[PDB]
Amino acid sequence: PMPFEEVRDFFYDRNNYIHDLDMAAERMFTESGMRTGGLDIQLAELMRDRFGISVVIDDNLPDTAKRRYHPDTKVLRVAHWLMPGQRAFQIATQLALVGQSDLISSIVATDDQLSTEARGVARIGLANYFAGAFLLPYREFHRAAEQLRYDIDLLGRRFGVGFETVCHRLSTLQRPRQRGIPFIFVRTDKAGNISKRQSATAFHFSRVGGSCPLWVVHDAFAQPERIVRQVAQMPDGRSYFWVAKTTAADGLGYLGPHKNFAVGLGCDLAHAHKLVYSTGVVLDDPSTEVPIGAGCKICNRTSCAQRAFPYLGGRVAVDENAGSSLPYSS
Amino acid sequence: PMPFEEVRDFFYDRNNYIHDLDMAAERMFTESGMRTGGLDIQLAELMRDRFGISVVIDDNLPDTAKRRYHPDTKVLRVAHWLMPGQRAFQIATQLALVGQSDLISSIVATDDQLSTEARGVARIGLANYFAGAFLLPYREFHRAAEQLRYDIDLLGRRFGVGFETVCHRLSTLQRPRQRGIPFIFVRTDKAGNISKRQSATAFHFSRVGGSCPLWVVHDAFAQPERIVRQVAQMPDGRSYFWVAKTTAADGLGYLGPHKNFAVGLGCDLAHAHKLVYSTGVVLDDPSTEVPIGAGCKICNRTSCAQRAFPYLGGRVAVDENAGSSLPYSS
Amino acid sequence: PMPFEEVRDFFYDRNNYIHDLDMAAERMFTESGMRTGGLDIQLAELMRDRFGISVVIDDNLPDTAKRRYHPDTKVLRVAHWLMPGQRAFQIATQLALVGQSDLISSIVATDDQLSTEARGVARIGLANYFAGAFLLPYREFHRAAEQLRYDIDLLGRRFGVGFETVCHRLSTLQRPRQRGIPFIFVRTDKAGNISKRQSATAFHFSRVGGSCPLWVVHDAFAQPERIVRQVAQMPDGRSYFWVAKTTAADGLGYLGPHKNFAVGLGCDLAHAHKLVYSTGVVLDDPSTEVPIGAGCKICNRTSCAQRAFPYLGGRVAVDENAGSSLPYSS
Amino acid sequence: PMPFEEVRDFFYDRNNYIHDLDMAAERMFTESGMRTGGLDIQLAELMRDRFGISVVIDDNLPDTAKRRYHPDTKVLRVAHWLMPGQRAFQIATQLALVGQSDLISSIVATDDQLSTEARGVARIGLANYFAGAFLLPYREFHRAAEQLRYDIDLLGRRFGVGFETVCHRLSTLQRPRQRGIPFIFVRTDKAGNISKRQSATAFHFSRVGGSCPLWVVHDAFAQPERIVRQVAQMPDGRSYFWVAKTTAADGLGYLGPHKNFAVGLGCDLAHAHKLVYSTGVVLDDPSTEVPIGAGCKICNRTSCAQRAFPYLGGRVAVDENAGSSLPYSS
Ligand SMILES: CC(C)(COP(=O)(O)OP(=O)(O)OC[C@H]1O[C@@H](n2cnc3c(N)ncnc32)[C@H](O)[C@@H]1OP(=O)(O)O)[C@@H](O)C(=O)NCCC(=O)NCCS
Ligand SMILES: CC(C)(COP(=O)(O)OP(=O)(O)OC[C@H]1O[C@@H](n2cnc3c(N)ncnc32)[C@H](O)[C@@H]1OP(=O)(O)O)[C@@H](O)C(=O)NCCC(=O)NCCS
Ligand SMILES: CC(C)(COP(=O)(O)OP(=O)(O)OC[C@H]1O[C@@H](n2cnc3c(N)ncnc32)[C@H](O)[C@@H]1OP(=O)(O)O)[C@@H](O)C(=O)NCCC(=O)NCCS
Ligand SMILES: CC(C)(COP(=O)(O)OP(=O)(O)OC[C@H]1O[C@@H](n2cnc3c(N)ncnc32)[C@H](O)[C@@H]1OP(=O)(O)O)[C@@H](O)C(=O)NCCC(=O)NCCS
Ligand code: SF4
Ligand code: SF4
Ligand code: SF4
Ligand code: SF4
């Protein structure tokens, strides 16, 4: 495998929850006297007071640089065009890399099979995890997620972060005795590439698969920047609730290159009733569930009109005397 | 490879043009006294007069059946819900299978490496090719495509066929001395699955690739039943004009299984000026071309903000002291 | 008022149901031996046999002409680009105008206040009503609408007509002892112009109003050619179920002028459970209903964040010391 | 007229530029030592140093309150969920109302026909104008708009403001000797309600009209958070370039009330070549211009297939012997 797949599996093997790192972030948040709201300024003062790091807002960085840290003089420059929550994320990432280096190193050490480059990629993944666990302190964030019935927009509003950051954190609430809904988080683009997979436990799309066009995550770009929802049934009978939305943040100019992603959060149908997104939806009727697969070549459904490729198991008859609206049927 | 890939390659190796079969379709159209306009009605009586086949419009066929042929009674049943052009397509498909069986077998014989199942799939593909070349007689269709400046909707209106059928036929106009624009034809779904590839000549997506989310074909579902267009530049500098549109032919009920596809037609930029779809677009300015790829793992571009995966030829730079809006950058 | 408003009110006063005309269409359908399926051909033979009218499919008419009738030689020319159901509609319209002229004249005579031009416009409206009542014979169409739970696509498939034609006919099922769901039918464009209003009984948007942006009919263009649905609550507490879909049929060329409309069907919430479109929706929860109005200037809702104009009744305070996300609040 | 129309006309009569107020904002920005970048922080301390006003970021304000000012304690509370540029806008609005009160009163006095309520609405409009001219200092903003070729996203990024705010300021650059492109600015919703009109000079939609569904501004909701563009020709031959985009600023919860607007900027075609949005479009070909109107009842075009209502100057032709794809044709 490749290094990003190695690190995806590194997080999947740990149920997408790193107890030592999460508790470290929360403990530092509390001991520093942090308060939710305007964390970028408080994080600047924590960098200065605890690490001698001077944080400066720089509009002189290249267009694509979100931050740069100069370790010779200990100066952290943060992009002016980042919103406060993004600035705080950048600062907390660097905070993990300079202030939690040994804890990150030992956590990486717990997987001896990781390749040389996968270890650095995992270091960056764990720094991102720390930044998420610092911006969204575990007990407070879990506590608000339950009060708000998992409304991602309201969570982002209360904590001053975006949709993708909230979904990231929601997929990590696997602390023993204070678990949230077990989620699978995915990020896709317009061509169906899934560039992020994180899961609390085993799901169909945790590691591979996900190229079924009836899956609602791919429909997010058809209805941009509005939450889509679906009650999906996999070919093995297991049922899931999926919500997805496009994240499209540029301001790189009309001519510039644009980045467009969709973020999806899925869970077992049995949890759907605790989500605000199930409002108005009937969840006790298996006939209203949408039948999806994992990708046409690994999907054994026999009567799918959307089917793009034949199922690789077994083969269908070819009939010169029949025409059908079900491709590769028999 | 699998059999549908074998037949995709069978047609690709022949420049998507089967001269003997195409000329057979045109000669039969002319000798039978056919006329564009109501071809379904004329095809029914040509079946009766020439092959003793009785064509019946059956509203008792199963919901998913487009046709069924009973060779014992020589009875062809066609679905009532097919529009006239689709009925004509079904009848001409059966006409190829019963009246051009030996020439189709002889054409198949020219590829000795075809597997046993690939031969049946190729028989059905060649019957479809014949039906297309019969509904859209080569010389008449070519002259209409040039007169209409390749307006696909206007061609469908003149010949009483749909969008996908016109694009199919347009990608086959490789008869020596009467060439149309050389096209690559693709059919995709919302998850990026490309279920059809047909090519007049060598193109980047003739056989594999096409999972770039900046390619306009994947943007077709965001703007349904609207033609989208793009001037694309591949990483090797070669430039192309792409037109695409969703086809949604259903009415299987609100609850029923739904069919959603997008069809794309691509050509060299040098031909774009004879397309009606080039109206209003500047074609002589390489800075206005959109830079796309074939798929992130096989794309070597250095500064793509949309990038989903690291390029396999490259290596993963990791910088703990920098944050960037360019994922997996060089 | 203007003539189209005069005729809209002419139909509204009659509960959108013309008993004499509807029974005439159904009686002629039965006495002529018509059968659902391929009505265009049977209507051609009925024109010839009963009225001496020769029906011909003409590709020589101007682009915009659907039909033309030459009364000196009794020849009806029908556009080749019309699908069979549209051809049948055209033929039945002319059939009403030549074969039901006196019945139409007396029905018009029952409204003495109609202006001179409104009488001709009403003649055309009643001919259209006859064509709808002939293509969709009352007892058979009502009988299928109940069996199919009002699935508009399935009704169109069975009767070979489009979405707008089915919705038209569904809004007319007010025959005593065999009434369908009482519907209001509207047609809008992208700018909110409502160009058709028909209602079985009194509804909020029967004659005026309908410019509320939270009403789902205006959202149809955001999700083109897919059915949208909404449980709406008017400011007076009454609740309604709304379904809408875009109808976009051109083939007038990429450069040509395009016609894009959305068609909406609404009913009281108490009927929603008989629609297939209520599947998966909770209808016994007044908290999940969306609060809409009739247009901001005639809407008295006090806490609408979407509000575009102040409500004309009373006035709100202007406060220099407050900023609010509720425009024109107080 | 009503008071919001009175104030729309107050600004329209002044070419959407208030010279004394604009120069006051710029002079105060310069004399205070302000710098673009973190204006919310600098505005808080300018309030404290110059007016004794204590600015507080209050997460205890009601959900819908952007600000509240207590003049007894001179305490300005600003909503925590406002991004920095919006916070700066709120503070500068209050700054206009407390620190430029007499000049605003004097500017209002120049329109003696303003009703008593229109004067308060004009006071708030002028405070908003001051806030815009303070956040976006005239000469600096004008030079940046010219350097960036009017790229609205890039201007928002440089100045830390949103799309609507930039378009607002762009429509005000009518200072003699330093003119920007003369623009008309509109804000619409999904139902076609135009809730804002601001104009540098006389335009067709400066005061009324704008309900043409072929106008690209109404197409913005079909392509959400994507800039749409159009070369439009009014029925009198005059041609315009239009850019539009939806603004969706919410996160009031999945169930909460939602805000959806589209903002459009229009100018003479002769200026289109200095816009970045003109990249790739041919502007010297009047056949490629789209023919639009001001609203169907006030539009005299003869062959519009989209037409919703009969033109009021015309008369209704009715032909019982013809069917046409042109509703209400001449
Ligand atoms: C996959 C990756 C390359 C994508 O890069 P990118 O597309 O440039 O985007 P980023 O993930 O850096 O940031 C985008 C959003 O994700 C959010 N995010 C990323 N990791 C997060 C985490 N662990 N917790 C919370 N939020 C997180 C950021 O806050 C950001 O929100 P914003 O856009 O509103 O500012 C990048 O996330 C990465 O390097 N991750 C670490 C390696 C890893 O875990 N790989 C496994 C892949 S499954
Ligand atoms: C690939 C395949 C299974 C797809 O099946 P499907 O999804 O049921 O769709 P079909 O292709 O049968 O029909 C869809 C449209 O394509 C059109 N079409 C298909 N082949 C055509 C041809 N050779 N010429 C013109 N039109 C054609 C049909 O007319 C139809 O138009 P319509 O929707 O208005 O009725 C089927 O086309 C097939 O078996 N093709 C032959 C095998 C082959 O060539 N495989 C390699 C393809 S990569
Ligand atoms: C309003 C009007 C001018 C619109 O014209 P148009 O936009 O050219 O469209 P048409 O209504 O002629 O036809 C469009 C669809 O409506 C359908 N339709 C129209 N009247 C119908 C009726 N009474 N029953 C069933 N279907 C009907 C047609 O079948 C057609 O379906 P199709 O597009 O798939 O072929 C036209 O309907 C008319 O003249 N109506 C009669 C006058 C009237 O009743 N005015 C009151 C206005 S509320
Ligand atoms: C019309 C009105 C009620 C709309 O209220 P609203 O829908 O709550 O929206 P607001 O205009 O208050 O704010 C929305 C955006 O417009 C921007 N805006 C408003 N006036 C502006 C100005 N003069 N310059 C720059 N930006 C301005 C705000 O900054 C805000 O940007 P944001 O969304 O990123 O925060 C309100 O703008 C108003 O009272 N205006 C003054 C009265 C007036 O001029 N009326 C005639 C208009 S036709
Ligand atoms: S066969 Fe149908 S259900 Fe299975 S993956 Fe393909 S589209 Fe999805
Ligand atoms: S790296 Fe960028 S250009 Fe290349 S395939 Fe991926 S998205 Fe397309
Ligand atoms: S005030 Fe709100 S609910 Fe009322 S019509 Fe306007 S947008 Fe609709
Ligand atoms: S008649 Fe046509 S061009 Fe004129 S306003 Fe109506 S839709 Fe627009």
**CA–CA separation, D164 and D245 (whole Å):** 9
Let me know: does A182 contact A201? Beta carbons within 8 Å: yes
Spell D272-285 as b/e; 16+ CB within 10 A means b.
beebbbbebbebee
C78 backbone dihedrals φ, ψ, rounded to 5°:
-120, 140
Contacts of D90 in chain C (CB under 8 A): 323
| Sequence-distant (≥ 6) Cβ neighbours of residue B307 within 8 angstroms | B296, B299, B301, B326, B327, B328, B329
- Using only C-alpha atoms, chain D has a radius of gyration, in whole angstroms, of 22
CA distance A244 to A185: 10
Q: Which of C222, C231, C280 sits opposite A282 (nearest CB)?
A: C280
Q: Is some CB atom of chain C closer than 8 A to the CB atom of A236? A: no
Ranges of H-type helices in A77-197: 84-99, 101-109, 116-135, 138-147, 152-159, 163-170
Contact predicate B85/B159, CB 8 Å:
yes
Residues of chain A found within 8 Å of residue C223, distances taken between Cβ atoms: 222-223
Please tell me which residue of chain C has the smallest CA distance to D90. Answer: C323
Ligand 8: centre distance to CA D212 (Å) = 5
Neighbour order of strands in the sheet with C54-58: C54-58, C75-79, C65-70, D322-324
Contact C281 A285 (CB under 8 A): no
B298 vs C11: CA distance, rounded Å: 64
User: A285's torsion region: left (phi>0), alpha (psi -120 to 50) or beta?
Assistant: beta
CATH number of A1-135: 1.10.10.2910
Name the amino acid, one letter, at B188: T
What span, in angstroms and rounded, lies between the C-alpha atoms of A168 and D282? 44
Same CATH topology for B1-135 and B181-294: the answer is: no
User: Among partner residues B223, B280, B285, which is closest to D288 by beta-carbon distance?
Assistant: B280
Name the phi and psi angles at D201, rounded to 5.
-150, -170
CA dist D247 and B165 (Å) reads 39
Cross-chain Cβ contact D224/A227 below 8 Å: no
Q: Please indicate whether, in this complex, the C-beta atoms of D281 and B281 are within 8 angstroms of each other.
A: yes
Spatial strand order of the sheet with A239-247 comes to A194-199, A184-188, A261-268, A239-247, A228-233, A290-291
C-alpha–C-alpha distance, residues D153 and D176, integer Å: 26
Per-residue tokens: B285? 């300015």
Tokens of B273: 């000026």
The partner residue sitting opposite C280, judged by closest CB among A222, A223, A281, is A281
Cβ–Cβ contact D281 with A under 8 A: no
Question: Is the C-beta atom of A15 inside 6 A of ligand 1?
Answer: no
B62 to B78, B325, D31: CA distances (angstroms) = 11, 54, 81
Q: Does residue C321 sit at the A interface (CB-CB below 8 Å)?
A: no
Experimental approach: X-ray
The 3-class SS string of chain C reads CCHHHHHHHHHHHCCCCCHHHHHHHHHHHHHCCCCCCCHHHHHHHHHHHHHCCEEEEECCCCCCEEEEEECCCCEEEEECCCCHHHHHHHHHHHHHHHHCHHHHHHHHHCCCCCCHHHHHHHHHHHHHHHHHHHHCCHHHHHHHHHHCCCCHHHHHHHHCCCHHHHHHHHCCCCCCCCCCCCCEEEEECCCCCEEEEEECCCCCCCCCCCCCCCCHHHHCCCCCCCCEEEEEECCCCCEEEEEEEEECCCCCCCCCCCCCEEEEEEEEHHHHHHCHHHCCECCCCCCCCEECCCCHHHCCCCCCCCCCCCCCCCCCCCCCCEEECCCCCC
Residue C104 · residue C96 · CB < 8 Å: yes
Bridge-based pairing state of the strands D228-233 and D239-247: antiparallel
**What distance in angstroms lies between residue A318's CA and the mean position of ligand 2's atoms?**
14
> How many angstroms separate the CA atoms of B132 and B153, rounded?
16
B67 to A97: CB separation less than 8 angstroms, yes or no: no
Neighbours of A40 (CB within 10 A): 22
Question: Which residue(s) pair with B247 in the sheet?
Answer: B261
Cβ neighbours for C238, distance < 8 A, ≥ 6 positions apart: C204, C268
> Which residue is it, tokens 């208030």?
D18
**CA–CA dist D148, D274 (Å, integer):** 10
Task: Give the full edge-to-edge strand order of the sheet including B322-324.
Answer: A54-58, A75-79, A65-70, B322-324
Cβ(C192)–Cβ(D211) under 8 Å? Answer: yes
H/E segment holding residue B67:
strand B65-70
Beta strands across the sheet bearing B184-188: B194-199, B184-188, B261-268, B239-247, B228-233, B290-291
The alpha-carbon gap from B179 to the nearest alpha carbon of chain A, in Å, equals: 31
Query: Under CATH, which number does the domain B181-294 receive?
Result: 3.30.450
Q: CA-to-CA distance for A224 and B183, rounded, in angstroms?
A: 31
What is the nearest CA distance from B84 to chain C, expressed in angstroms?
8
The per-residue DSSP string of B188-205 comes to E-TT--EEEEEESS--TT
Sketch the domain layout of chain A as residue ranges. Answer: 1-135, 183-294, 295-330
* Cα–Cα dist C193/C210, whole Å: 9
C-beta A160 within 6 A of ligand 1: no
DSSP state of D72: T
**CB pair distance less than 8 Å for B324 and A64:** yes
At position D35, the amino acid (one-letter code) is R
State how far the Cα of B98 lies from the Cα of B71, in Å rounded to an integer.
9
Eight-state DSSP code of residue D297: G
Q: List Cβ neighbours of B195 (8 Å cut-off, separation of 6 or more).
A: A308, A309, A327, B187, B188, B189, B261
CA atoms within 13 A on the CB side of B144: 19
CB atoms within 10 A of CB A169: 25
Residue C73 to residue A99: CA distance in whole angstroms: 95
Which of A231, A260, A259, A261 minimizes the C-alpha distance to A243? Answer: A231
B239, B319, D72: which is closest to A121 by C-alpha? B319
Radius of gyration of chain B (CA): 22
Q: How far is B132 from B123, CA to CA, in rounded Å?
A: 14
- Interface contact A231, partner C, CB < 8 A: yes
Please tell us whether the domain made up of C182-294 is placed in CATH 3.30.450: yes
Residue C298 Cα to ligand 7 middle (Å)? 9
The answer to whether C260 touches C189, Cβ cutoff 8 Å, is: yes
Cα–Cα distance for residue pair D281/B229, rounded to 1 Å:
13
Give me the phi and psi of D194, to 5 degrees please: -95, 105
Contact A80 D277 (CB under 8 A): no
- Rounded-to-integer distance, Cα C293 and Cα C212, Å: 6
Helix extents (H) in chain D = 3-13, 19-31, 39-51, 84-99, 101-109, 116-135, 138-147, 152-159, 163-170
CA distance to partner chain D, nearest, from residue B280 (Å): 5
CA distance A138 to C121: 69
Resolution, in Å, please?
2.5
First to last CA, chain A: 37
Structural contact between residues D64 and C325, judged by C-beta atoms closer than 8 angstroms: yes
Of B223, B279, B282, the CB nearest to D280: B282
Determine the residue of B212, B230, B311, B330 to mutate for testing ligand 6's pocket, defined as the one with the most ligand atoms within 8 A of the Cβ atom.
B212
What are the C-alpha distances in Å from D226 to residues A120, B214, B222, D197?
37, 14, 11, 21
Spatial distance between the Cα atoms of D128 and D120, rounded to a whole number of angstroms:
12
Cα A46 → chain centroid? 27
Chain D's closest residue to C312, CA to CA, is D2
Cβ atoms of C164 and C247 within 8 Å: the answer is yes
- Which of B219, B233, B154, B225 has the alpha carbon at shortest distance from B188? B219
Whether residues D66 and C195 touch (CB distance < 8 A) is answered with: no
Residues constituting chain A: 330
Helix (H, G, I), strand (E, B) or coil at D268: strand
Relative to the CA of B213, which ligand 6 atom is closest?
7
- Count of alpha carbons within 13 Å of D38, Cβ hemisphere only? 16
Residue C12: count of CB within 10 angstroms of its CB: 18
Is the CB–ligand 4 distance for residue D196 below 6 Å?
Answer: yes
Partners of residue A189 in chain B, C-beta under 8 Å:
213, 306, 308
How far is CA C136 from its chain centroid?
Answer: 14
Residues 6 or more apart in contact with residue D143 via CB below 8 angstroms: none
CA angle A84, D221, D80 (to 5 degrees): 25
Name the nearest CA neighbour of A22 among A142, A113, A114: A142
Give yes or no for D13 touching A (CB within 8 A): no
d(CA C22, CA C226): 31
Structure tokens at C286: 């007044």
Check CB contact of A84 with chain D, cutoff 8 Å: yes
Structure tokens at C188: 């809008």
All residues of chain A having their beta carbon less than 8 Å from the beta carbon of residue B70 are 321
CATH architecture, domain defined by A183-294: 2-Layer Sandwich (3.30)
Token pair 């199942």 is at which residue? B117
Q: How far is CA D272 from the centre of its chain?
A: 18
In Å, how far from its chain's centre is CA D182? Answer: 13
Pocket test for ligand 5, best of A296, A328, A329 (most atoms within 8 A of CB): A296
Cβ–Cβ < 8 Å for D314, D304: no
A55 forms bridges with which residues in the sheet?
A: A76
Nearest Cα to A75, choosing from A56, A89, A58? A56
At residue D57, the 3 state secondary structure works out as strand
Ramachandran assignment for C160, one of left (phi > 0), alpha (psi -120 to 50 degrees), beta (any other):
left
Residue carrying structure tokens 């060329």: C253
The β-bridge relationship of strands B290-291 and C54-58 is unpaired
Please work out whether the CB of residue B186 comes within 6 Å of at least one atom of ligand 6.
no
Q: How many angstroms separate the most distant Cα atoms in chain A?
A: 80
